[PDB]
Amino acid sequence: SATSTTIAKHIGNSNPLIDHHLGADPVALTYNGRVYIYMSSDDYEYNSNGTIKDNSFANLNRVFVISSADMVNWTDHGAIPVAGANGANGGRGIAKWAGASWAPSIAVKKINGKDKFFLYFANSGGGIGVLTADSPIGPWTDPIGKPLVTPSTPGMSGVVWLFDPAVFVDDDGTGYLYAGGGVPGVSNPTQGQWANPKTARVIKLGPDMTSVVGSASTIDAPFMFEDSGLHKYNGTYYYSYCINFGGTHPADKPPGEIGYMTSSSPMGPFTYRGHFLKNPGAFFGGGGNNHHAVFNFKNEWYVVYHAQTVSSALFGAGKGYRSPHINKLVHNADGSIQEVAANYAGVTQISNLNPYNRVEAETFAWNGRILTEKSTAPGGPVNNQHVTSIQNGDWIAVGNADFGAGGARSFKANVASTLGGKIEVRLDSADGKLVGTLNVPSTGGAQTWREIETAVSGATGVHKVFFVFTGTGTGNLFNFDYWQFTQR
Ligand SMILES: O[C@@H]1[C@@H](O)[C@H](O[C@@H]2CO[C@@H](O[C@@H]3CO[C@@H](O[C@@H]4CO[C@@H](O)[C@H](O)[C@H]4O)[C@H](O)[C@H]3O)[C@H](O)[C@H]2O)OC[C@H]1O
Ligand SMILES: [Ca+2]
Ligand code: NA
Ligand code: NA
């Protein structure tokens, strides 16, 4: 009954994090037991004849957000319509001054006893903006109505590409913004311009995280290119960035790789240490921009980065379209960082999923091959999505659902369907033990939602769980908002 194949994130593998769409320039928020990943909205551009053309970043006007409690099952929180200029996101789009929202950065700060969230983004190469929210997934407000940082921000002149923000809230509650990149000398930098672009910047933020304090300092990242990052390990601040591709490079600053520098203060002085992530081309073939954030989630150090692993699998060429990956990052006893072993296997699931809570359908580890959108389902979480583009033989799967010793009694699915179909609930594999079959009736339409219940038996212990979609003809069989098992 399950016939569709995984594009790039194969069952058992944790990279790329998702493959049912793209997501470039990832950054991580760790918050109340979940990692959020916020991403540039990579999205295929097409020639007029419907063939794919190389990514020119034309579609980078949203921020894609996924989250996980376990590194394997990703809840799709959909898209934040950040860019509102030109104009389009069809209306919708939150920062009216910004035509683009590249390379997000995310921070949370408790203000007046309430957690407040701050999403930073680059309006292409021209400035940094910020949105605010009372939850990591929104809804979002543009407090300011203009960029937060421009070339006129003190200290920011001399930056070639005023982009790739990284916002770090220090242990004392002070925010810092790292930004910049590009290489001076336009079409022909001299060797020395390659070697010391002097286009990286850090600026301190005001307490409210929507203003700057003082002037930006230059970080002299050798062979700076883009992709500022900041993490703090054992009291030391690590400024990381992508090394440029031009000029001759010494062996210790290899082109297109992630370099890093350390300092005992967030604003420097920084000393190059420092490379830990080869170009994604070195691992997955070969190659492109390289774009990364280091974070600690549930007591482990990771780097999120991107690679052209979904587009290459679909097209035979990555064409600049990028997908998020995570691997472990290891700090040595001396504080240096080991080369990250970027791969497909990725990170092993760190905790089980509880299938007795409401679980969004768009919370899955693997799929073949569906889409997620914006749902009309009543209620649900902020920016509630559903699984759609469900055809016969499609499926989604969660990793390590723990049904417990007693096991499940029933399975509920919130579904909307014009003609109906089935959800087969299978353990371990797409062709695995059938524990139940939910008959999706005609509900009256794709926006008319019914919670359907069906019996489950044989579902005990920890398993991958596959929801295999079947139906006749069509089209879209149904959309698929959330599910919940009952005990026992
Ligand atoms: O409008 C401005 C944009 O144009 C500017 O876009 C940047 C263009 O450069 C992007 O970096 C690319 C990454 O790929 C490099 O080539 C690789 C060299 O090794 C080969 O193995 C591999 O196949 C190649 O892909 C290329 O040299 C380098 O320029 C950068 O990420 C973009 O940001 O952005 C700012 C806008 O203001
Ligand atoms: Ca949902
Ligand atoms: Na970033
Ligand atoms: Na499909």
Q: Are 88 and 76 in contact (CB under 8 A)?
A: no
Give the residue among 374, 400, 401 at the shortest CA–CA distance from 388: 374
Q: Are 452 and 442 in contact (CB under 8 A)?
A: no
Q: Which atom of ligand 1 is nearest to the CA of 182?
A: 35
Residues β-bridged to residue 261: 239, 272
The CA-based angle 376-377-380, given to 5 degrees, is 120
Residue 312 host element (H or E): helix 309-315
Binding region for substrate: 289
Q: Is 320 in the pocket of ligand 1 (CB under 6 A)?
A: no
Residues β-bridged to residue 388: 371
Give the residue among 170, 165, 160 at the shortest CA–CA distance from 149: 165
Order of strands, sheet of 63-68, starting from the edge strand that comes earlier in the sequence: 24-31, 34-40, 63-68, 74-80, 363-364
**Alpha carbon distance 361, 467 (integer Å):** 9
Residues β-bridged to residue 14: none
Helix (H, G, I), strand (E, B) or coil at 96: coil
Q: Is 185 in the pocket of ligand 1 (CB under 6 A)?
A: no
Q: Is 318 in the pocket of ligand 1 (CB under 6 A)?
A: no
Q: What is the resolution of this structure in A?
A: 2.0
Q: Within a 10 A sphere around the Cβ of 114, how many other Cβ atoms?
A: 8
Q: Are 19 and 8 in contact (CB under 8 A)?
A: yes
Sequence-ordered list of residues with C-beta below 8 angstroms from that of 247, at least 6 positions apart, any chain: 189, 191, 193, 194, 195, 223
Span 7-351 CATH architecture: 5 Propeller (2.115)
**Alpha carbon distance 348, 283 (integer Å):** 19
CB-count burial class (<10 Å; 0-12, 13-18, 19+) for 71: buried
Residue 306 structure tokens: 């991107």
Q: 7-351: same fold as 1-6+352-488?
A: no
Helix (H, G, I), strand (E, B) or coil at 414: strand
Atom 24 (ligand 1) nearest CA: 288
Annotated active-site residue 134? The verdict is no
**Alpha carbon distance 104, 307 (integer Å):** 17
Q: How far is CA 77 from the centre of its chain?
A: 10
Annotated active-site residue 373? The verdict is no
| Tokens 């680059």 -> residue | 122
**Alpha carbon distance 370, 385 (integer Å):** 13
Residues β-bridged to residue 310: none
d(CA 225, ligand 2 centre) in Å: 39
- What DSSP assignment string belongs to 253-309? S-TTSEEEEEESSTT---EEEEEEE--HHHHHSS-----EEEEEETTEEEEEEEESH
SS3 content of the chain, % helix, strand, coil (to 5): 5, 45, 50
Which sequence spans correspond to the domains of the chain?
1-6+352-488, 7-351
| Tokens 């194949």 -> residue | 5
Atom 16 (ligand 1) nearest CA: 288
Residue 314 host element (H or E): helix 309-315
Q: Which atom of ligand 1 is nearest to the CA of 246?
A: 27
Residue 77 host element (H or E): strand 74-80
Q: Are 479 and 387 in contact (CB under 8 A)?
A: yes
Task: Give the Å distances, CA to CA, from 479 to 303, 383, 416, 474.
Answer: 33, 16, 5, 13
CB-count burial class (<10 Å; 0-12, 13-18, 19+) for 75: buried
CB-count burial class (<10 Å; 0-12, 13-18, 19+) for 91: exposed
d(CA 164, ligand 3 centre) in Å: 5
Residue 402 host element (H or E): strand 395-402
Task: Give the Å distances, CA to CA, from 305 to 41, 101, 293, 325.
Answer: 14, 18, 7, 5
Q: What value does the CA radius of gyration of the chain take, rounded to a whole number of Å?
A: 23
Sequence-ordered list of residues with C-beta below 8 angstroms from that of 258, at least 6 positions apart, any chain: 227, 229, 240, 241, 242, 243, 275, 276, 277, 290, 292, 303, 305
Sequence-ordered list of residues with C-beta below 8 angstroms from that of 385, at least 6 positions apart, any chain: 76, 77, 78, 360, 362, 372, 373, 374, 375
Residue 475 structure tokens: 């089209």
* Choices 2.60.120.260, 2.60.40.10, 2.40.50.100, 3.40.50.1980: CATH for 1-6+352-488: 2.60.120.260
Q: Which atom of ligand 1 is nearest to the CA of 125?
A: 37
Q: Is 125 in the pocket of ligand 1 (CB under 6 A)?
A: yes
Q: Are 182 and 164 in contact (CB under 8 A)?
A: no
Annotated catalytic residue within 226, 227, 394, 424: 226
Q: Are 394 and 469 in contact (CB under 8 A)?
A: yes
Tally: H helices and E strands in the chain:
3, 32
Q: Is 286 in the pocket of ligand 1 (CB under 6 A)?
A: yes
Residue 427 structure tokens: 């353990």
Within 13 Å and on the Cβ side, how many CA atoms surround 356?
Answer: 14
Q: Within a 10 A sphere around the Cβ of 112, how many other Cβ atoms?
A: 5
